[PDB]
């Protein structure tokens, strides 16, 4: 019976804040939030840290300094507040989730000095373990003296009572666990790593284990980037200890009007000029690919991929792909890997990988036994790591059949349903895929159909928006120009590039354009119809036939081109240019 | 190994070095230690304690007229060949090669003086007995079957048989049943005379300079002449090519030769001694003495002999090219020829090689390659 004056004062002030603090409307927002919380599956209530800081700066400072110490008392305050208010179940777990924390530390900055205090970190999930109930406040009975030990809290380990409850008896070794009376809570072990944004060049990322509980258990899926608000703590491991970030709340990491308001005056002026800049298409292509010659169509397609179309979900719960997939089949050399490397370097969220990767993930989500825990864990693959980004996959022709089928499913349904060893999950993966491949035998036989030239399965080929064939022309002028480019690059170590727009400018312009969702005008509709009429009438011989899949790719490219200029509606110019691109990408047999 | 009784094994003494004496010895070093022999108590009719040796000083160590007359005899060398395991009837040239191995090279400066020999043959052709005899006759000897290389026991280096050789001879019976890692280790031993070992990611190099005498059996029973080398054996061809001399022993049934061998064995069983020969085999101690006397010399190779040696080499290489099957001819062969010639020069106790020695070495090399016939 020892009372922590700090804990009691914090509990009192927290309850006062809950029952007095009100929104701009003058009503207690948290009253309505809790009223929502009464519903089943809602056992966690979010709280705005800035709000309580305004209500009581001292209270916020104390909670930040000693969040872990006071958290149980905050939970008790929430329990008291909710119990007496409405018809909530008499006894079910409740929790408080904190957000709006201005201080965003890096995994590098998590030091032992920060143990026990609230903090927010940003990372990328790598693997996720199965949910498991865990005893938090165990209850035991002494065998000799048959007295029930209660509320013997365990610090994340099988901590039996030190000695019997009875002063008379000193069994000390034969306590029996009362499973029914024991208090359990559902914990999930996740692993996170430094996001590429914060990752120093050529530095191994820091892997941090986190514990998810209550509403946050299933919030974070493998391969996604998320921000966790919680507190770093220590856990004994077989006086050894290891660090784990117990996260109270999990949120996704970080509208056009919102971005423009947030964007600086000079940056917004530059972007506005870009939108008003005619011929921005070719200018941006050339700026983004300085160390390349020719292959203008490849650069056009890559840029259109970078922008992307408008995803659509039907009323019947059917997802229509919004992003496009590009493949580049090329003779030896010809700068394919250079294209992929440029795309990866320029664009954040773009990940480069090879079809020869031997990782257990194997370029997609997998299930693997942990070396220590020996429990199956869903490990995210590179394709997952490219979530809402780009996956530049090289040696695409050399992928394994296992990864081949996984990638086929991913690009077909835009999600990967992985079930094995009793574990099951459905990982969302909306990732544009830029694949590089070599013709069978090394050199592309232009007198043969594309199928005969590559080993990719028919479904993979069908589900690709654009195929770009790079044939090593024997023309002297082309080779002379390529030599000129390479030699100028190597001699003029820098300053050889002529970027009409800076890389950062291109990145911010792409982010601004993403906010638009161009619509299709009835004029655009009929123009698309007529273009597909012509494409079908062509009916040739072409390497691969033309199906409605090509029409879908056409409309997606048209959406991307509309996004190029940021116009919110489609015009015949975009449709005709997309038709030109797709039709040119088609290669006829030269026999 | 010199002091060990014939029917016993070496015994070990723990030595506690301290002060400046530390880092003055390495595994495989033939050393002499002066120190106090004291007990360490780390109770039947009194206390029982383990003993050690408190080191004080550690220092790494390195006939009659008729004897000389016998050395002067031309057949002397042949006689010594006859003394190499006299009970082993036949294999005279093999015995000669073994003697050459025992006397080793010269390493004139430096040249790898060890003469590695391999004996591949069908079961039951006295190979193991030969290896045992060599281990008994060579002053510093190790016997193994396939450990051989060093190890890091748990945190102390522990020299394997190869290290314990350290300028001795390592006789490896049942060579064909050696582990691949061990094969790589012996390859390194024959290449640089050093053993590289790493247990905790640390590449430690130990000086293992020792001649290797390997014995192997063809897989799937007796050797098949119709099948090429490495077809009846499961050893890498390159590894075999490393050996200076590779002798194939075939148990071809020949009524005359088989009868002779049977007569020899029967005489042994009926007299516990081999049949009398032209020259009585010499006592092992005397053989060792003569071997050491030979080790004294480091004969040179006069430039004049170079011409003839080169001529012979080019001739034999041309013959190998004429031969349909590659006979492993390479610069290695020339190096081996030189080593053998200088070993014979050591046997002659003459500081200058002679035409005779070169011719004899060439003959032995040819006879090995023919043994592969």
């Amino acid at each position: 019976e020892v009372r922590d004056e700090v804990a009691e004062k914090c509990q009192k002030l927290f309850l006062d804040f809950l029952e007095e603090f009100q929104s701009s409307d003058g009503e207690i927002k948290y009253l309505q939030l809790a009223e929502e919380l009464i519903r089943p599956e809602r056992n966690t209530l979010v709280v705005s840290f800035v709000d309580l800081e305004q209500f009581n700066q001292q209270l916020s400072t104390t909670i930040q300094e000693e969040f872990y110490r006071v958290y149980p008392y905050l939970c008790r305050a929430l329990k008291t507040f909710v119990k007496d208010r409405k018809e909530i179940p008499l006894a079910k777990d409740f929790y408080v989730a904190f957000q709006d924390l201005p201080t965003r530390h890096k995994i590098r900055e998590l030091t032992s000095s920060r143990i026990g205090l609230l903090t927010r970190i940003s990372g990328q999930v790598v693997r996720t373990h199965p949910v498991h109930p865990e005893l938090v406040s165990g209850t035991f009975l002494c065998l000799d003296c048959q007295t029930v030990i209660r509320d013997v809290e365990q610090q994340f380990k099988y901590t039996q009572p030190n000695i019997c409850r009875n002063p008379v008896c000193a069994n000390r070794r034969r306590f029996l666990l009362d499973t029914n009376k024991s208090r359990f809570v559902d914990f999930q072990k996740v692993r996170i790593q430094e996001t590429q944004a914060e990752l120093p060049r050529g530095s191994i990322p820091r892997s941090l284990e986190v514990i998810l509980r209550a509403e946050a258990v299933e919030s974070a899926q493998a391969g996604d980037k998320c921000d966790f608000t919680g507190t770093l703590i220590v856990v004994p491991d077989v006086l050894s200890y290891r660090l784990v970030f117990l996260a109270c709340c999990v949120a996704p990491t970080n509208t056009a009007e919102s971005i423009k308001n947030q964007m600086t005056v000079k940056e917004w002026e530059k972007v506005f000029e870009m939108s008003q800049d005619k011929n921005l298409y070719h200018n941006l292509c050339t700026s983004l690919f300085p160390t390349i010659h020719g292959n203008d169509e490849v650069k056009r397609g890559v840029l259109l991929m970078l922008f992307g179309g408008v995803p659509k979900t039907t009323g019947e719960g059917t997802s229509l792909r919004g992003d496009i997939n590009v493949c580049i089949v090329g003779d030896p050399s010809t700068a394919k890997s250079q294209f992929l490397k440029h795309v990866e370097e320029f664009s954040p969220r773009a990940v480069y990988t090879s079809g020869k990767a031997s990782s257990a993930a194997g370029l997609t989500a997998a299930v693997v036994r942990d070396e220590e825990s020996h429990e199956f864990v869903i490990e995210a693959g590179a394709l997952m790591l490219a979530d809402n980004g780009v996956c530049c996959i090289d040696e695409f022709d050399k992928m394994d059949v296992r990864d081949q089928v996984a990638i086929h499913e991913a690009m077909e349904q835009q999600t990967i349903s992985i079930t094995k060893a009793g574990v099951k999950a459905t990982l969302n993966a909306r990732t544009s895929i830029l694949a590089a491949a070599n013709p069978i035998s090394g050199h592309y036989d232009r007198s043969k159909s594309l199928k005969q030239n590559i080993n990719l399965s028919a479904p993979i080929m069908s589900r690709f928006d654009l195929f770009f064939i790079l044939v090593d022309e024997c023309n002297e002028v082309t080779d002379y120009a390529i030599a000129r480019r390479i030699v100028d690059l190597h001699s003029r170590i820098e300053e050889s590039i002529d970027r009409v727009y800076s890389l950062d400018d291109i990145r911010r312009y792409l982010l601004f354009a993403r906010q638009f969702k161009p619509k299709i005008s009835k004029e655009s509709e009929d123009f698309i119809v007529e273009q597909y009429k012509h494409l079908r009438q062509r009916d040739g011989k072409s390497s691969w036939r033309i199906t409605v899949r090509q029409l879908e790719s056409m409309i997606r490219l048209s959406e991307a081109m509309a996004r190029m200029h940021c116009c919110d509606e489609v015009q015949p110019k975009h449709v005709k240019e997309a038709f030109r691109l797709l039709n040119k990408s088609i290669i006829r047999v030269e026999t | 190994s010199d002091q060990v009784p014939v029917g016993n094994i070496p015994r070990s003494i723990t030595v506690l070095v301290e002060g400046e004496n530390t880092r003055i010895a390495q595994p495989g070093d033939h050393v002499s230690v002066t120190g106090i022999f004291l007990p360490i108590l780390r109770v039947v009719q009194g206390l029982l304690s383990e003993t050690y040796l408190e080191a004080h000083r550690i220092v790494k160590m390195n006939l009659t007229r008729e004897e000389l007359r016998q050395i002067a005899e031309e057949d002397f060398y042949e006689k010594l060949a006859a003394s190499i395991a006299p009970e082993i009837y036949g294999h005279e040239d093999v015995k000669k090669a073994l003697l050459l191995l025992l006397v080793g090279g010269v390493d004139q400066s430096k040249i790898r003086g060890n003469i590695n020999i391999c004996l591949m043959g069908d079961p039951g052709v006295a190979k193991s007995q030969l290896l045992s005899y060599i281990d008994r006759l060579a002053p510093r000897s190790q016997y193994t079957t396939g450990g051989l290389t060093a190890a890091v026991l748990r945190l102390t280096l522990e020299g394997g048989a190869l290290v314990l050789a350290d300028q001795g001879v390592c006789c490896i019976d049942e060579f064909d049943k050696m582990a691949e890692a061990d094969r790589t280790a012996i390859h390194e031993v024959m290449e640089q005379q050093t053993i590289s070992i790493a247990k905790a990611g640390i590449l430690t190099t130990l000086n293992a300079r020792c001649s290797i005498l390997a014995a192997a059996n063809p897989a799937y029973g007796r050797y098949n002449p119709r099948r090429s080398l490495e077809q009846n054996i499961q050893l890498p061809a390159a590894l075999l090519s490393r050996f200076d001399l590779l002798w194939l022993i075939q148990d071809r049934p020949d009524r005359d030769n088989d009868l002779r061998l049977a007569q020899h064995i029967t005489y042994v069983h009926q007299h516990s001694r081999q049949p009398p020969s032209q020259f009585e085999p010499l006592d092992m101690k005397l053989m060792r003495r003569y071997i050491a006397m030979c080790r004294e010399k480091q004969p040179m190779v006069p430039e004049s002999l170079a011409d003839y040696i080169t001529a012979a080499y080019v001739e034999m290489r041309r013959e190998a090219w004429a031969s349909k099957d590659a006979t492993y001819t390479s610069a290695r062969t020339l190096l081996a020829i030189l080593r053998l010639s200088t070993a014979l020069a050591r046997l002659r106790m003459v500081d200058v090689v002679e035409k005779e020695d070169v011719n004899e070495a060439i003959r032995l090399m040819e006879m090995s390659k023919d043994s592969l016939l």
Partner: protein
């Protein structure tokens, strides 16, 4: 003075303050001002500066680091409160001396150095996650929850075994989270192979980084670590208090340094010999004297030793450029391939020799193994990040190792999926591979790919494929026999110094004449291939070789002579592996 020393706190602090203020290459005040804005409260000081300014102070610092460093800290804090008297910092400045006593002969270390500051150069082999070590344990009674604290209980924690408010029996349990911890990271660092004279048994040391300077050195990094030598007892059994009479020893790091040459005589000598018109040919001849009649192969390996100039393409967005030269010596057994590989490994500093077989003692890959801590262990490729990896028996390799080799030769980095995280260990190595054709001999009329059976892409990555065979020529055999017998009956040191000087100082750059010559040569190669044609990778190889040759001549700029030599060497290699 503190017992058993020659140290006065006031006088020592005053001397350190005088050193800070009165010095000539004042840099300390400059970096104090820099720390003001930066806020980084760690004043790094080169101890050699103190040695030059005051040898007595340097000796005192080395002898008693633990007792002297706090005085320097106090002096620096007082100065920082003098200059910029107003400022905000979470903790006052700290001083971390370095580069004081280069007793880098780790194999030659003595107990006389216990509790003395020492700096040692080496490559870190392994590390571990930061360990939180208690410093103020917090306890609460199971009965009455009586809170109590035990502060700095000399490592271990003194269990009260009895409460203080109910005074019950032992019932006060420790609360991990309520306690206080400090960061302590363990590192296992191997002695630098180059510095060891014999290197029969490379030495290893254990380092502890405390409260800071954690995770500042990644595995495989070659650094100079300066810290206090420490010896601590080891208990025979944790339950008993008995301790071994032999102490295990480690280092408490104080400073990390990530990492002229010789004298004016050596630079003058190398310049003089560079002036020789045939310095290229003479250097080629000096390399590997044992070998005979091989000139193109020797020149190629020499250019590889020099390698191309380092270039920064980060601005261009094209990614890292492989400035290193990869050479594959393909030949029948007995052509002296392994002799060249060993000689190159025995000459270049920080070089590594390995065998294509998985049985190789080193291994051409890195992987995680349990200590039982699952820590990473580096491979040969990562080990020789800037050295030369001499791979022998390169032909016989598993497909996984082939993929690893392709990745490292392409991106100059190795990707390892430890646990779930993918780490890209930078490995900008120079690959010198040796391959022996399958079958006893090399079958003519078959392409190198057919007769070696390796992926076409992987061999296309190589910038020079040198084919060497044992001709069936009596004259060649006679010449080789004469050479060997003569060997029977320029020192490498000067070559190594010349290579080191070229790497350290010179950095060739292209020239307009060289640019035009390169373009003309490439278009000529294209035209020849018009009728295995030319590829731009060939142009990259030509430019890299030209840069290396310019580095050999010390021109500092690519010259038409370099272009001609590079083109001729490339054509010779082509011929070697050519067929028609």
């Amino acid at each position: 003075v503190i017992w058993g020393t020659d140290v006065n706190v006031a006088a020592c602090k005053e001397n350190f303050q005088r050193f800070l203020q009165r010095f000539i290459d004042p840099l300390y005040m400059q970096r104090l001002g820099e720390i003001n804005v930066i806020g980084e409260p760690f004043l790094n000081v080169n101890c050699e500066h103190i040695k030059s300014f005051d040898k007595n102070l340097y000796r005192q610092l080395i002898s008693y680091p633990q007792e002297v460093i706090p005085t320097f800290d106090m002096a620096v804090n007082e100065i920082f409160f003098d200059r910029y008297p107003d400022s905000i910092l979470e903790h006052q400045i700290q001083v971390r001396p370095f580069n004081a006593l280069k007793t880098k002969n780790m194999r030659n270390l003595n107990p006389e150095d216990i509790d003395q500051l020492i700096t040692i150069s080496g490559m870190v082999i392994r590390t571990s996650q930061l360990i939180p070590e208690m410093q103020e344990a917090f306890f609460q009674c199971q009965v009455c929850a009586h809170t109590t604290r035990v502060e700095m209980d000399r490592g271990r924690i003194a269990e009260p075994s009895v409460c203080g408010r109910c005074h019950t029996t032992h019932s006060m349990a420790l609360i991990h989270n309520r306690s206080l911890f400090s960061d302590k990271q363990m590192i296992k660092l191997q002695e630098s192979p180059e510095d060891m004279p014999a290197g029969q048994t490379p030495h290893t040391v254990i380092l502890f980084a405390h409260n800071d300077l954690v995770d500042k050195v990644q595995p495989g990094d070659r650094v100079n670590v300066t810290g206090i030598y420490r010896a601590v007892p080891i208990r025979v059994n944790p339950r008993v208090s008995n301790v071994k009479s032999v102490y295990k020893t480690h280092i408490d790091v104080i400073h990390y340094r990530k990492t002229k040459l010789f004298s004016e005589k050596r630079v003058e000598l190398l310049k003089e010999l560079s002036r020789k018109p045939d310095i290229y040919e003479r250097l080629a001849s000096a390399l590997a004297p044992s070998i005979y009649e091989h000139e193109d192969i020797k020149k190629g390996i020499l250019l590889q030793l020099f390698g191309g100039t380092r270039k920064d393409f980060s601005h261009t967005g094209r990614g890292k450029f492989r400035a290193e030269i990869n050479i594959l010596l393909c030949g029948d057994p007995g052509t002296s391939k392994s002799q060249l590989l060993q000689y190159v490994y025995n000459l270049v500093p920080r070089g590594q020799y390995t065998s294509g077989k998985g049985s190789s003692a080193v291994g051409l890959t890195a992987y995680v193994m349990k200590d039982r801590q699952l820590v990473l262990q580096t491979g040969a490729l990562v080990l020789s990040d800037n050295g030369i990896c001499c791979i022998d028996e390169f032909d016989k390799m598993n497909e996984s190792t082939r993929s690893v080799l392709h990745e490292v030769m392409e991106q100059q980095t190795l990707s390892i999926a430890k646990a779930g995280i993918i780490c890209q260990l930078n490995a900008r190595t120079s690959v010198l591979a040796a391959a022996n054709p399958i079958e006893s001999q090399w079958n003519p009329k078959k392409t190198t790919i057919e007769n070696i059976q390796l992926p076409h892409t992987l061999l296309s990555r190589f910038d020079l494929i040198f084919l060497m065979l044992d001709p069936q020529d009596e004259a060649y055999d006679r010449r080789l026999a004469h050479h060997l017998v003569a060997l029977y009956y320029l020192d490498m040191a000067v070559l190594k110094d010349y290579i080191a000087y070229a790497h350290s100082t010179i950095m060739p750059r292209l020239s307009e004449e060289a640019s035009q010559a390169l373009i003309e040569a490439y278009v000529d190669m294209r035209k020849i291939g018009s009728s295995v044609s030319a590829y731009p990778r060939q142009l990259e190889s030509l430019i890299r070789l030209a840069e290396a040759h310019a580095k050999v001549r010390l021109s500092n700029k690519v010259e038409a002579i370099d272009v001609e030599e590079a083109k001729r060497l490339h054509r010779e290699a082509l011929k070697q592996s050519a067929t028609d």
